């Protein structure tokens, strides 16, 4: 009588903080160059819960560079004060590489409440190599002594000031990172920390945040390693400072998020993309690296197998013809073109809202991959990734709690080769939703308590 998926609300796993992306390295500046119509279409496809992906997290870069040449993110303190005991020279431009505008829109127009500010590097004058690019380490960490002096507290004060500048512009930074890919030396903003050096810095940053006049004390994150395997390798050294930070972060480049890390903290997958793959907007062709289907399955893997509480693609909107970004902007034409990778992330984010709890679901046939989430508002979202033909599915709840009320209505949306989070029939009868899950799709079925 169709396949029945039964949600067990009494078996719970990780909280979901949400889904998102970045506009770092002046990708936000590229959005700002669009006509007003195009700016709003780019902001809608990213953040709109009615006509967009409903992304619920924005990752901002804490600019390290002396200026905005090339795609560099200028620092709030680009000029050296000479000694780390001298006051830092802040030169706040009220733009932050156009990330403040994107943030203000995300928060005030679209209701986003999670903002993750992550430094790729300290300013060059705070580092062993005197540059924010080409690796090097923060002056004054163990094994990183500098003629210029110990810049560790100055770096903590600087990160705190950046958060303060966002606060005074009506945006709360909720999460704060001080490194990115700390195993990697690159030709752009980059900075090398060992796990011990990360733990040493957290000892200094934590009391700096805790003692500050910040209205909201942001959660310290570590360490945006390039994969699960590399980040897992840092957790031993980090365990001595588990009382001093509250978020573990890693990318999906050098390994996949396929296992639960041994950490007490929530874990986010903060960066993945097909960075160099030829642009495609396709949902499904053959399961290649850029296809919407592939990315819908990557998010599934990170949440169900990696115990991720969040999933961020690298870039939202950007110019150029690789899959590093979800949304193509043609600066000439003033056009915005979402790939089916944007719709893949949205097929999660629209229905699995911040503060959702992952809950057990059973009944899936071999062609179906399923997961279920109970939202803070009591709505229950059930993900079905269908690798087979169309599949008639029934969705129902069970609980061991008599406080859990039966749902009063259901709706369903699908993304596939012809649909972008398009509503499909959800035939509801006495607590059960019946849906025809399209061939080669990700479908989400949501059961709603009565608003009336
Ligand atoms: C087609 O060039 C693309 C690059 O090949 C690709 O790596 C990316 O380059 C960005 C760079 O992205 C980093 C990817 O590695 C991560 O560890 C790191 O966090 C990211 O920052 O970021 C710096 C920026 O200057 C490069 O452009 O995207 C390139 C693109 O043009 O899309």
Q: Are residues 178 and 274 in the same domain?
A: yes
From the alpha carbon of 70, which atom of ligand 1 is closest? 25
Of 318, 336, 354, the position where a domain reaches its end is: 354
Last residue of a domain, one of 354, 369, 392: 354
Nearest by Cα to 428 from 444, 412, 405: 412
Q: What are phi and psi of 381, to 5 degrees?
A: -100, 130
- For residue 275, the CA-to-ligand 1 centroid distance in Å is 7
Co-location of 62 and 42 in the same domain: yes
The strand pairing partners of 189, in sequence order, are 133
425 lies in which domain range? 3-11+358-448
Sign of the C-alpha dihedral computed for residues 29, 31, 37 and 43 taken in this order: negative
Q: Can you say how many angstroms the Cα of residue 442 is from the centroid of all Cα atoms in its chain?
A: 20
State both tokens at 226: 């390039």
**Ligand 1, atom 32: closest residue by C-alpha:** 324
Instruction: Look up the CATH number of the domain holding residue 289.
Output: 3.20.20.80
278 and 399, same structural domain?
no
Question: Do residue 327 and residue 368 come from a single domain?
Answer: no
Same domain, residue pair 193 and 269: yes
Query: By what technique were these coordinates determined?
Result: X-ray
Identify the residue whose C-alpha is closest to ligand 1 atom 24.
25
CA 174 – CA 178 distance, rounded (Å)? 14
- Would you list the DSSP string of 224-249? EESSHHHHHTTHHHHGGGTTS--EEE
Rounded distance from Cα 374 to ligand 1 centre (Å): 35
- 3-state SS, one letter per residue, for 299-354: HHHHHHCCCCCEEEEEEEEECCCEECEEEEEECCCCEEEECHHHHHHHHHHCCCCC
Q: What's the CATH code of the domain at 418?
A: 2.60.40.1180
Q: Give the residue from 336, 354, 372 where a domain finishes.
A: 354
CB pairs under 8 A, 24+ apart, for 259-265? 259/228, 259/232, 259/305, 259/306, 259/307, 260/306, 260/307, 261/228, 261/231, 261/232, 261/235, 261/307, 262/232, 262/235, 263/235, 263/238
Asked if residue 385 and residue 348 are part of one domain, the reply reads no
**Is residue 299 located within the same domain as residue 195?**
yes
């Amino acid at each position: 009588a169709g396949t029945t998926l039964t949600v067990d609300l009494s078996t719970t796993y990780q909280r979901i903080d949400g889904f998102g992306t970045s506009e770092a390295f002046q990708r936000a500046v590229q959005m700002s160059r669009l006509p007003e119509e195009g700016q709003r279409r780019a902001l809608d496809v990213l953040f709109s819960t009615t006509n967009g992906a409903g992304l619920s997290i924005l990752r901002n870069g804490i600019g390290s560079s002396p200026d905005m040449s090339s795609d560099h993110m200028v620092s709030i303190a680009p000029k050296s004060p000479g000694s780390p005991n001298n006051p830092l020279i802040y030169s706040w431009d009220g733009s932050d590489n156009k990330q403040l505008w994107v943030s203000q829109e995300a928060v005030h127009t679209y209701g986003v409440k999670t903002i993750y500010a992550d430094a790729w590097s300290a300013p060059g004058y705070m580092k062993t190599n005197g540059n924010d690019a080409n690796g090097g380490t923060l002056c004054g960490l163990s094994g990183a002594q500098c003629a210029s002096g110990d810049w560790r507290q100055a770096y903590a004060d600087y990160l705190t000031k950046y958060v303060e500048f966002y606060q005074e512009s009506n945006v709360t930074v909720t999460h704060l990172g001080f490194i990115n890919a700390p195993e990697l030396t690159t030709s752009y903003a980059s900075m090398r920390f060992s796990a011990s050096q990360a733990a040493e810095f957290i000892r200094i940053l934590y009391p700096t945040i805790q003692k500050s006049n910040l209205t909201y004390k942001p959660t310290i994150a570590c360490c945006d390693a390039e994969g699960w395997n590399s980040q897992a390798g840092m957790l031993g050294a980090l365990s001595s400072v588990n009382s001093m930070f509250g978020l573990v972060t890693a990318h999906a480049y050098t390994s996949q998020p396929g296992f639960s890390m041994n950490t007490p903290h929530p874990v986010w997958m903060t960066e993945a993309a097909d960075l160099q793959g030829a642009w495609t907007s396709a949902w499904y062709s053959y399961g290649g690296a850029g296809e919407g289907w592939t990315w819908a399955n990557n998010v599934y893997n990170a949440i169900v197998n990696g115990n991720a509480s969040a999933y961020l693609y690298w870039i939202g909107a950007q110019t150029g013809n690789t899959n590093s970004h979800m949304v193509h902007i043609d600066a000439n034409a003033g056009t915005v073109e979402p790939s089916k990778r944007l719709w893949a992330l949205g097929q999660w984010s629209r229905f699995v809202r911040p503060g959702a709890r992952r809950v057990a679901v059973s009944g899936a046939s071999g062609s179906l991959r399923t997961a279920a989430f109970r939202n803070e508002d009591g709505s229950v979202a059930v993900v079905v990734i269908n690798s087979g033909g169309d599949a008639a599915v029934n969705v129902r709840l069970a609980s061991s709690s008599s406080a859990d009320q039966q749902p009063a209505s259901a709706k369903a949306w699908a993304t596939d080769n012809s649909r972008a989070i398009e509503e499909i029939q959800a035939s509801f009868a006495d607590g059960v939703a019946t849906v025809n899950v399209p061939s080669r799709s990700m479908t989400t079925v949501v059961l709603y308590p009565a608003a009336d």
